[PDB]
Amino acid sequence: FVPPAWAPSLFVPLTGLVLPAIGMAWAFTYIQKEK
Amino acid sequence: AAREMWYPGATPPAHLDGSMLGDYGFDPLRLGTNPDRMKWFREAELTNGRWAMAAVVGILFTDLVGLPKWWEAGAQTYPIDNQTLAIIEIAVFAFLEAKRYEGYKKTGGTGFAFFFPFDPMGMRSPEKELKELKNGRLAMLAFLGFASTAAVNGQGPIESLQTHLADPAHNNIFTSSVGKESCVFVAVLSVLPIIIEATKTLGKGKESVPLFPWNEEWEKVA
Amino acid sequence: MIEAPVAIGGSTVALLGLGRFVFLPYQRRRTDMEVGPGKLGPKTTGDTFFDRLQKPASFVETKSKDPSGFGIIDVLGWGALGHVFGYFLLACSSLQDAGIDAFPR
Amino acid sequence: NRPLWLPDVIPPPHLNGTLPGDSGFDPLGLGLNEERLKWYVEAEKTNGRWAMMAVTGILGQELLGVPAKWYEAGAAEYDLPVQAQVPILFLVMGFLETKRFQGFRETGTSGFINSFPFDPVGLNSPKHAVNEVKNGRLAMVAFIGFAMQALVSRTQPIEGLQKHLADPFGKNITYFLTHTPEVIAGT
Amino acid sequence: EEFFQRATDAVSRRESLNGFVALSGIAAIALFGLKGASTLELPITKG
Amino acid sequence: ATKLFPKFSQGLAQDPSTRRIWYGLATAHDFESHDGMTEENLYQKIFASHFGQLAIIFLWTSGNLFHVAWQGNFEQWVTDPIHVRPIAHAIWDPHFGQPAVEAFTRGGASGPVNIATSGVYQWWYTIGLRSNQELYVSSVFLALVSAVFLFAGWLHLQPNFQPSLSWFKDAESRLNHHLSGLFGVSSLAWTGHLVHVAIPESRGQHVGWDNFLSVLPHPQGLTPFWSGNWAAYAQNPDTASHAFGTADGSGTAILTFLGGFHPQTQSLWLSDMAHHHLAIAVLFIVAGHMYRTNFGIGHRLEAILEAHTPPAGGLGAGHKGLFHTVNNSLHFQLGLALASVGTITSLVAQHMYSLPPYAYLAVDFTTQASLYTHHQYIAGFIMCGAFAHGAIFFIRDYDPEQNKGNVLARVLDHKEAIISHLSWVSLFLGFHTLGLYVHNDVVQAFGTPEKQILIEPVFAQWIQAAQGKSLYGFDLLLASSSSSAYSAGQSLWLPGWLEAINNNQNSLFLTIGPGDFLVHHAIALGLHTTTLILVKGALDARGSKLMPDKKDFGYSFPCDGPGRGGTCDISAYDAFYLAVFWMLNTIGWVTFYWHWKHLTLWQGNVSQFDESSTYLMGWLRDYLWLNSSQLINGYNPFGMNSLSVWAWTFLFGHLVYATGFMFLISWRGYWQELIETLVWAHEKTPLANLVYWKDKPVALSIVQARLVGLAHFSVGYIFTYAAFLIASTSGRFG
Ligand code: CLA
Ligand code: CLA
Ligand code: CLA
Ligand code: CLA
């Protein structure tokens, strides 16, 4: 239903810091992978 | 991954051969596609479950003998200052966990102090640790239930059981403030075996492994 | 106003009569150069499930028990046209009896 | 040899007639895959069984005189609330459906729990299968009719049957479709 | 020479180090906001 | 070499350079060039990608619904659709300051919020949504729809469920079904929802799922539909003094042709929209039984194409052989679809502002401006894509032996004449439009503005007089009672249409002067020149006098080198990339015209636009310079107002435009030598040569150079104009 008041205080940090970091780490492993 | 699985009619994963005890094949995301990673995860699960048994039996004893609520028990005035209590807890754990890690590196067991494994009477058997893993998983699910029932109901385990016994039709996890969320969550949990069976029947060949950044299962996909 | 049953029935009966006795000789000669055997005709071989799903079923062309070639597919099409014309006439009459003049004065 | 659409002969080549209750009713050519057509046969049988249970539940609930109308019982008051009913309704019936689907993939027939045949008494006649398929199609038609009684007439099924029996000319589709505001305003 | 050798022993392996850095980053990011902010008068939760 | 990232390209896998990443991303969805793949696999990938694109669309609109319902003022906007601005989404920026938080607290919110310019508030108020719970359940329903579309994309790509190659090639059945089901019964369901919910909600009656099947949409109750007395639905329409939220001045009419706009909200009537969608539904369902399906009746597309060959050799072989050309080439259908959708998007832009379909949308000036600008830019981009994919069709899949002597072979035969005539009309339009604009600017500079050339747009003014506008005078149709067009339907929609078209406040057929005619002719110049570039690229795609074998080099190749005088930007891709610049200029012109004319209309100083759009200095000063005062004052050393973000993204757009120039002016060689020197510097230093690159750094390719410069150019263009438009329309209006 209605998200809590700390939801903007929590969800934006993941998708702004650690979700791009995890995606960039996975993609960087994907580019340089050999067979 | 054993004949008894997480849902009936399931197929075990390729990396889960059932060699490890306590296996039920409940690996939807496949975070354990490595022998060292799964032995470390097995040790970690055993720790988070053994301390769960200790916490569950302690909380049950405190509720039985009349001690106050556990999640509010940290604010009461106790002997010895909390700062020096924290620093001596850190001091004793910096030796205990160090010895545990060194013993796991040299033996692999969940030993204590200097005796690795700490088995003086000698009750060690695979069935004993299988029951230990099962009871630890049950105790930590019970601890999650204790934390959940202490946040939206404000009552302990015995009071939660009393409220369930008073009127089970309207006093449950599906009638509280998280009741509709619990209904959606359990509908999703009932719909998972109808999706995964459909993909397993559809996926007669290939691999169809889930692709996640943590595991290297996508290496063989491309 | 015009009563709905008489108008609808007359329109669909006239359209079906035009389909059977009038436009049927003009039918099967506009489809002669449309789906004929001399031209490409069929569009699918019918190998797998989708290819034979493209293939016509055995229901629309099995036989014609009518003396003409008026199958039930043509019956449905001409009846739909008759219902359309009858509802058009009923709609025009309904607009007429409401006191509204849509024609240029 | 087969009922077909009508006594006129419409023989299809894809449906020879070996299926239970096979009148060859494929005007749009739905069943030609020869692999998912067995799945459609199982779907027709299971939908017929569910329609059987639905129509017999509606008839029994109206005959025994429940207070709520047959499609109005969802919002009715019960000892167990609706929020306490959806969890077990999903869980145990999902377990049953998963076991039934696994049995269908293993053998090719339906089944309640584990065992494929589910025949404590037997009676597995081909005539019984044909009767099951035809009674299931009739139950499907009956459930569609019941939903249409709820939609157009907004009345109970046997109540609508009594209305049609008492006044055949005045309680038909023409009256119930030309008097919709009267039906909305309490019949 | 004993120090700074077994300190990294449980984190030397790639999987352990990646899990530790991911767990620490996620914990610090989740602590930010409801616990990291609103204590150092950060001008986003005041209004 | 042989890296795993370009799994769809073995040649790109054995590329020991950074370009392998770039070409691994740009060629991601070009399945026709992927190695070891067939037409059936390509079609299945197309199906899965379409399901994914749909799931993304549904997720985006579900997120819009959720972010309006949560941290929004939809109920407050429902209560007061004039005063309180809509809220798009909340702002949680830890880099914000206290004045930034205080300045962004608008619309009665508890924190920093963004004022919505999308128009979802007006749309959802018009269609009947009133509460936040309805938006919540709509968002979760659309999330579930995206989930089942993900299920469809996964399932239809699975083995034993992949459709056959001929299944997609069933053109007649696809046309029949998407005409009957995707268009017809979908519109029928939409007008049913309109009649059931939106008209009662616009008449103060709440119709939800709980009270559904118990509230009659019409007091007669479906018996006029059976009896054919359909005029009973158009019996009691809403009066002029009718409140949209309440039942005051209401009526009982679900379908009518009450032309014009609702006087209270300056929007189209709900019953008019319901009748429109119902008529569209029945017409589409009727048209959806044309083509030959598995039944014995219908039309064959190939036979229609064969038959429509004009006699006496007017079109040569006619339209013969075109059915296989369209069916075999995906790029032909892609170009046709993108062209039609771009034309429809341009129609939507040109008809939404003049005919506002949503309640309280005409009063929201910033919303209408942003919607028009977005729709026109999307339309221009996808028309450019249509022509580009037509060039791709001409290069990749076009067999002259198949369609020999047909219309395609004929337009390839006289392509020089078409290109030359388009160049002539573009040169004529540009030469004389610039001559008149410079003449007017010089005349106004000399202090005697009456010497300027002002040609009155008598053609469009006569058209508008023929459609009801009596301000220009004349005695044409829809303006004199003796005309047959006026007498026909004089009690049907003219009493509303003439009232809406004779008012100067709304945007329905605004008064046009000589400056309007000049800017329309400039728009025609932009359209003709962009068309000339695109058809020069498409017609000379497979060959030219400089490059006869352009089909053998593919669609996107850099050049042929300095031989034969120089051959840079000779591919059809480069013609598309120049036409993107020209399309951006054209849409900039149309949006400048729309923005200035509407700003002067909203301010009431239409004479300022009439006497100032004649000369380009008026465009630069009274539009670009006068309306930018509030934009650039968003943040300054004095303080900050609510338009600080718009100033920041305005400077952002100017900077990305500048970076587009960075990638566009210089081409390759300087960067290759600079990267070589940087490679030597990194290799010949201590403490940093230990870490080495796995892929060799190289300069970006010339095609990649054009792509990156075009992307930065377009991003800067869009961001700059969006910033200026929204800031100017919101700093002085609400
Ligand atoms: C605002 C800047 C600008 C201007 C004025 C032009 C003008 C022109 N371009 Mg260009 N273009 C530009 C920017 C510009 N371009 C940019 C940035 C791009 C993206 C790379 C393109 C991409 C592009 C393509 C892809 C094509 C053109 C074409 C054209 C012609 C269009 C025909 C026309 O409108 O009549 C001409 C109108 C004009 C205003 C031309 C300027 C002539 C004026 C009147 C001065 C004449 C001389 C004057 C008497 C002074 C004499 C003395 C002086 C020489 C010292 C024209 C020469 C097309 C072409 O060649 O046409 C066939 C074509 O194919 N351009
Ligand atoms: C119905 C829509 C549609 C469809 C299905 C296609 C499909 C296709 N087109 Mg077409 N195209 C379209 C619309 C469409 N396009 C439009 C609207 C345009 C005009 C812009 C083009 C212009 C175009 C050209 C010029 C070419 C294609 C090509 C292709 C193929 C390659 C796509 C691929 O897999 O690579 C995936 C491609 C990418 C991932 C590149 C996307 C990069 C974009 C521009 C970045 C986004 C901009 C920006 C940075 C976003 C951030 C904003 C910032 C503010 C944060 C494929 C057949 C190519 C082809 O057939 O090869 C010969 C080709 O040369 N198309
Ligand atoms: C009647 C049955 C039927 C229906 C309903 C559909 C429906 C669909 N199919 Mg089709 N299809 C059918 C039968 C059918 N199919 C058959 C029989 C075949 C085999 C011969 C196919 C073969 C087929 C293929 C091969 C593909 C589809 C695809 C699609 C999708 C098209 C994109 C879309 O969502 O439209 C969106 C567009 C509209 C609803 C209308 C167009 C917009 C115009 C301009 C009108 C705008 C209306 C209005 C002004 C704007 C309203 C919104 C605004 C207010 C915000 C859609 C889900 C495609 C797909 O996978 O999904 C993308 C695809 O690639 N179909
Ligand atoms: C150092 C100088 C400089 C430079 C290089 C730029 C660069 C830019 N500005 Mg900025 N600007 C600057 C200073 C500068 N600015 C200053 C100091 C201000 C005042 C604060 C502005 C105010 C400003 C506004 C208000 C806008 C820009 C826009 C733009 C972009 C131009 C897009 C384009 O190519 O349009 C190509 C050119 C046109 C489309 C038309 C040019 C303007 C004419 C005079 C309007 C009349 C055209 C009309 C249709 C008739 C002409 C037809 C023809 C046949 C004769 C680009 C990012 C615009 C933007 O972001 O993109 C649209 C925009 O809206 N700037």
Ligand SMILES: CC1=C(/C=C/C(C)=C/C=C/C(C)=C/C=C/C=C(C)/C=C/C=C(C)/C=C/C2=C(C)CCCC2(C)C)C(C)(C)CCC1
């Ligand atoms: C290159 C190429 C291509 C492409 C193309 C394109 C892209 C095109 C476009 C085109 C277009 C884009 C067109 C358009 C057109 C339009 C039109 C044709 C219109 C018309 C109109 C009308 C006719 C109207 C009328 C009217 C009305 C109805 C109302 C009012 C009045 C009037 C009378 C005016 C392709 C792919 C094919 C391939 C080949 C090559």
Ligand SMILES: CC1=C(/C=C/C(C)=C/C=C/C(C)=C\C=C\C=C(C)/C=C/C=C(C)/C=C/C2=C(C)CCCC2(C)C)C(C)(C)CCC1
């Ligand atoms: C049995 C038989 C017979 C008879 C027959 C008949 C007599 C018939 C009739 C018929 C008729 C007499 C009719 C039909 C019809 C059909 C159809 C198929 C229809 C359709 C319709 C539709 C489709 C509609 C639509 C619509 C709607 C829905 C709404 C709106 C409007 C419209 C109109 C659009 C005979 C003896 C000869 C022979 C033997 C057999």
Ligand SMILES: CC1=C(C/C=C(\C)CCC[C@H](C)CCC[C@H](C)CCCC(C)C)C(=O)c2ccccc2C1=O
């Ligand atoms: C400056 C410049 C460079 C230097 C640019 C380089 C070396 C490319 C790398 C630039 C940075 C490192 C890109 C950073 C990442 C981007 C955001 C894009 C990659 C990530 C997205 C795909 C998500 C060129 O190579 C070049 C080539 C051709 C014409 C003009 C120029 C040019 O102007």
